[PDB]
Amino acid sequence: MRVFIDEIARHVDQEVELRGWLYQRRSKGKIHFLILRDGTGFLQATVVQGEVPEAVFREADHLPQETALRVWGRVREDRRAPGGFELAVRDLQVVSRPQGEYPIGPKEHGIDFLMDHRHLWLRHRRPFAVMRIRDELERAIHEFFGERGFLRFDAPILTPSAELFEVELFDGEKAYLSQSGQLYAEAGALAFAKVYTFGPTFRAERSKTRRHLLEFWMVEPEVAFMTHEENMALQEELVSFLVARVLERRSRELEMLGRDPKALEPAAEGHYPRLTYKEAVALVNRIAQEDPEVPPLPYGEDFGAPHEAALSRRFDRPVFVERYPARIKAFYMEPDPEDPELVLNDDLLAPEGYGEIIGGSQRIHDLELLRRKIQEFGLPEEVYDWYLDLRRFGSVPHSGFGLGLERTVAWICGLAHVREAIPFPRMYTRMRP
């Protein structure tokens, strides 16, 4: 029967067919050591002279990289093979040979070259591991919220009015690409108690930093009656579950990426530290004095990326920063009962310098307060009228957050740039392939 390398350990000492591509070849006299990939993994396949037909052994002697082929053989249990298993080849059929030199040969390639050839580079071991860890998280997120009784609520991408990317529609009229679905999620929250969006979002960010895409995916849970304290608990619950799931089921992928499991274990176990904005600023300024490279943060200013980086390295797991000043936050955020100047909001910083992976807050449930803050921020009340209906009719305290998938993937996989954490990234100077 045809099998995948994924489940090769099941079919020990058994006749199997593999369908895939030649990744690596090493012909030593009267034996070929192939490395096959079938899209589910990488496996050693030996073609010994005598055990195969001579016509087979000739093709295998001059068989280039990314040769599509079908392979028949018995699965041995070799201790000194990758993964602890190999295939003893009995017959081989070539399906396709490369037209030209395969661009991603056995050389050091620059990131630009690799990203230009991303459609091929995805076939290789490191991207392979990343996209599998990405898949694991996408499934895990669904299971997580599914069992909690949350309802997936796809927010719209095309948004009527309002930097943002604008879309030319019909007869001159224009729409904009969603930067966040939270406003719609709030409608869904009052409709279905506990919801979450899970679609793409688009920010026209001129940055070319290691944590910004023009196009990325954001999981945005929103729950009715849920408070700021509960918001952070749910955030902790999600991120710790996700990291645990990767450690449990994608340890082989982590190893391929050279990622130390012990870096992630604490994140999986929860008990995330909690700072206030005030305490966090103090700690940053304390670090800033110790290390001149870490810049200081004047109280009232927002956290730049180097502030978050330095702050996150002081802990072994994600850290919450809560209760920022109202003046540097969004209009919809509920103010702190004790301190009018603060808002009940939180960011979760991943460790090892990765910084913000989640951003959330409690939302205003009072009609006149929200109405008052709309004008204070100098926003047109017309465009947020449907948003105000959520305060006019059946208003309740509610909270939510947005989890960046690419950020979380980058952190968990230990990547240098978020672009590597999505099949085909879209940045300022990168729109291809």
Ligand X SMILES: Nc1ncnc2c1ncn2[C@@H]1O[C@H](COP(=O)(O)OP(=O)(O)OP(=O)(O)O)[C@@H](O)[C@H]1O
Site for ligand X in 307-366 (CB under 6 A): 356-359
Is 423 a binding residue for its own copies by CB under 8 A? The answer is yes
Q: Which of 30, 58, 139, 252 binds its own copies (CB under 8 A)?
A: 139
Let me know: does 253 contact 132? Beta carbons within 8 Å. yes
Using CB under 6 A, which residues numbered 408 to 427 contact ligand X? 418
Using CB under 6 A as the binding rule, whether residue 205 contacts ligand X is answered as: yes
- Number of chain residues interacting with its own copies (CB under 8 A): 90
Structure tokens given for 213: 């895409």
Q: Which does 407 bind (CB under 5 to 8 A by kind): Mg ion, its own copies, ligand X, none?
A: ligand X
In the bound complex, what is the minimum distance in angstroms from residue 262's beta carbon to ligand X? Answer: 24
Of the residues 318, 335, 359, 425, which one makes contact with Mg ion according to CB under 5 A? 359
According to CB under 8 A, which one of 16, 21, 355, 357 is a site residue for its own copies?
21
CB nearer ligand X, residue 86 or residue 308: 308
Helices (H), 150-259: 182-192, 228-249, 251-256
- Pairing relationship of beta strands 398-404 and 355-363 according to DSSP bridges: antiparallel
CA–CA distance, 58 with 49 (Å, rounded to integer): 10
Q: CA distances (Å), 417 to each of 103, 114, 407, 427, in order?
A: 23, 14, 9, 11
Positions 300 through 339 that interact with its own copies (CB under 8 A): none
Which are the contacts of 323, defined by CB distance < 8 A and separation ≥ 6? 276, 277, 278, 336, 339, 342, 343, 344, 345, 346
User: What CA–CA distances, in Å, run from 212 to 44, 56, 367?
Assistant: 38, 50, 35
- Closest contact distance (angstroms) between CB of 205 and its own copies is 10
Q: Which residues between 154 and 183 bind ligand X (CB under 6 A)?
A: 180
Structure token pair of residue 29: 């006299």
Residues 75-104 that bind its own copies (CB under 8 A): 95-96, 98-100, 102-103
Contacts 24+ apart (CB under 8 A), 240-244: 240/267, 240/268, 240/269, 240/270, 240/272, 241/140, 241/144, 242/137, 242/140, 242/141, 242/144, 242/408, 242/412, 243/267, 243/268, 243/412, 244/268
Tokens of 208: 């070319």
Give the residue with the Cβ less far from ligand X, 236 or 356: 356
> Judged by CB under 8 A, which of 154, 230, 316, 352 binds its own copies?
154
Q: Decide: is 142 part of the binding site for its own copies (CB under 8 A).
A: yes
Residue from the set 50, 105, 106, 149 that interacts with its own copies by CB under 8 A = 149
Give CA torsion, residues 419, 428, 379, 223, to 10 deg: -10
Window 379 to 408, contacts with its own copies (CB under 8 A): 386, 389-396
Q: Which of 31, 167, 263, 330 binds its own copies (CB under 8 A)?
A: 167
Nearer to its own copies, 39 or 300 (CB): 39
* By CB under 6 A, residue 194 contacts ligand X: no
Looking at the DSSP bridge assignments, the partners of residue 88 are 46, 74
Give the binding-site size for ligand X (rule: CB under 6 A): 17
Rounded to whole angstroms, the Cα distance separating 239 from 257 reads 20
Identity of the amino acid at 114: L
Q: What does 404 bind: its own copies, Mg ion, ligand X, none (CB cut-off 5 to 8 Å by kind)?
A: ligand X
Residue 193 contact, options Mg ion, ligand X, its own copies, none, Cβ 5-8 Å cut-off depending on partner type: its own copies
Task: Choose, by CB under 8 A, the member of 45, 87, 134, 257 that binds its own copies.
Answer: 134
Question: Could you give the angle at the alpha carbon of 383 between the alpha carbons of 380 and 389, nearest 5°?
Answer: 110
Smallest distance from its own copies to CB 42, Å:
12
Please say which residue, 351 or 359, places its beta carbon nearer to Mg ion.
Answer: 359
Structure tokens at 138: 């996408």
CB 349 within 8 A of CB 314: no
DSSP β-bridge partners for residue 202 = 215
Q: Check residue 194 for interaction with its own copies (CB under 8 A).
A: yes
Are 222 and 399 in contact by the 8 Å Cβ rule? The answer is yes
Nearer to its own copies among residue 53 and residue 394 (C-beta) = 394
Least distance (Å) from ligand X to the CB of residue 308? Answer: 8
Q: Which residues bind Mg ion (CB under 5 A)?
A: 356, 359
